């Protein structure tokens with residue numbers, strides 16, 4: 001996505017466009033004839049201002065792509081005249097070099113889920129100092145839209161956030177994670193952004209919604225104060241029993257006295273929430289009577305919530321995907337059983353030459369405990385492919401905890417080559433599916449190279465991967481892909497220009513939470529076979545029976561990774577550490593029930609095309 005997917009949903013958000021158009025109309029008609037749009041994007045708000053009757057509008061845009069996009073959009077609405085587009089950061093605008101005079105109004109949307117994270121403060125400190133007329137002591141004085149913001153917080157239970165920042169278990173498929181290894185997420189990048197109005201498994205409010213801070217965007221003396229201001233130590237009373245998983249954060253923008261917009265979680269709004277995961281506590285269970293403690297500081301750009309507590313030893317930093325992995329139990333229970341079945345078929349004497357062990361290579365991209373599980377099964381010499389030294393220490397300490405004598409687990413990294421001179425691999429684990437929901441690049445090549453390093457009857461895991469698909473009517477996937485005409489942009493012609501950058505395939509999708517309608521059943525779209533390349537789909541057609549009548553907009557897809565013909569891992573399972581993906585159609589097709597719809601699935605290297613025929 002060269003053009004950020006936020007651009008599509010926000011331009012389709014008719015409410016937001018109307019609230020901003022009314023607020024700018026109000027300001028213009030009250031004398032604000034000179035407007036500066038910071039982060040103009042497609043330049044809709046700048047076009048609003050000129051349409052409202054502003055004399056001169058100046059639209060600055062950081063991104064080259066978005067700047068060139070606005071030039072076309074503004075030019076195409078026959079408004080190139082009174083609006084100057086500036087490929088620049090706000091900070092680098094100078095009067096009179098770039099803009100003739102100081103402006104009487106600033107409009108800005110440089111706002112993320114945690115409000116401050118797109119540098120609105122720094123931008124508006126500069127604006128008052130250099131670009132804006134003096135404030136009120138109208139065409140005489142300068143003002144900003146939005147005028148002010150109120151930042152809210154809420155302690156929440158949410159097992160979906162939990163499984164991404166905390167390792168919930170003490171034992172994974174036979175191996176024990178020692179108490180002396182403390183797994184922390186990277187958020188211990190201070191907040192993640194989630195559409196909490198549809199987060200899988202929902203969330204529960206453990207506290208009442210509380211006020212984290214306020215900001216007056218029309219007060220320069222206040223904005224300059226935030227960098228040095230001492231953190232606000234607070235404690236929020238608990239109102240419901242549950243597990244403290246995160247502090248869910250949103251805000252309310254006051255554009256003017258009459259118009260406001262909230263990022264409060266809602267299936268009506270497009271807005272996402274700042275999620276501050278809770279970790280590094282002995283217990284997470286909170287009850288009515290207890291207090292959620294935290295320090296709030298906005299000193300260096302981001303809103304920070306540190307020192308989260310409740311009032312009534314090696315550290316291994318894992319990625320969220322790696323924590324999710326450690327919590328994906330079926331994945332590890334499957335791998336344990338699938339490996340042992342192969343260890344039994346080769347040399348069942350070695351399953352729990354004496355000096356010769358089972359050679360097991362794990363080529364999993366990131367952190368993985370598959371080698372340890374293997375080590376517990378029999379006379380096995382397992383190899384780790386972890387790069388990070390922090391990961392090596394953790395796995396060494398896990399190995400110690402699972403009664404491995406020193407140097408039992410080896411580290412391959414410090415090219416796919418034989419384990420020894422005249423010895424071959426009994427099992428080779430490969431990384432087939434990206435977290436994105438697409439196939440790993442050069443998987444067929446690594447699979448082919450790996451086939452030749454195998455012992456007689458040895459196995460690459462997974463042996464094959466089936467991609468499953470689904471016909472869905474999803475307005476949501478459609479409205480996140482392409483702008484729906486002119487109506488939503490309030491008569492302005494922007495859709496034909498932004499929709500040039502239409503993504504064919506949506507990645508990092510939470511299929512489970514997606515609002516859509518199934519028009520079919522999950523159907524096998526292609527086979528990717530690691531043991532037998534010949535059974536790989538080159539470019540095959542699939543006949544999909546249409547179970548429900550509706551407007552086909554997308555084909556969500558996931559995988560069934562087969563370790564053997566019996567044991568299969570699902571990349572769409574509840575505990576899955578993979579996200580799913582979807583082919584979104586450029587033009588939606590109306591499908592009738594009882595109809596045998598054809599899909600043209602082309603597969604080359606790790607790329608897959610799906611089209612309606």
Ligand SMILES: CCc1ncccc1CNCCCCSC[C@H]1O[C@@H](n2ccc3c(N)ncnc32)[C@H](O)[C@@H]1O
Nearest residue numbers: 006039060061062089090109110111112113263271272
């Ligand atoms: C509650 C949050 C939220 N929830 C849900 C969806 C969306 C969103 C919010 N939107 C999120 C994507 C941030 C937009 S940034 C606005 C646009 O303006 C540009 N920009 C950014 C800073 C800047 C500058 N100093 N000078 C000039 N242009 C500047 C950026 O490159 C960008 O194109």
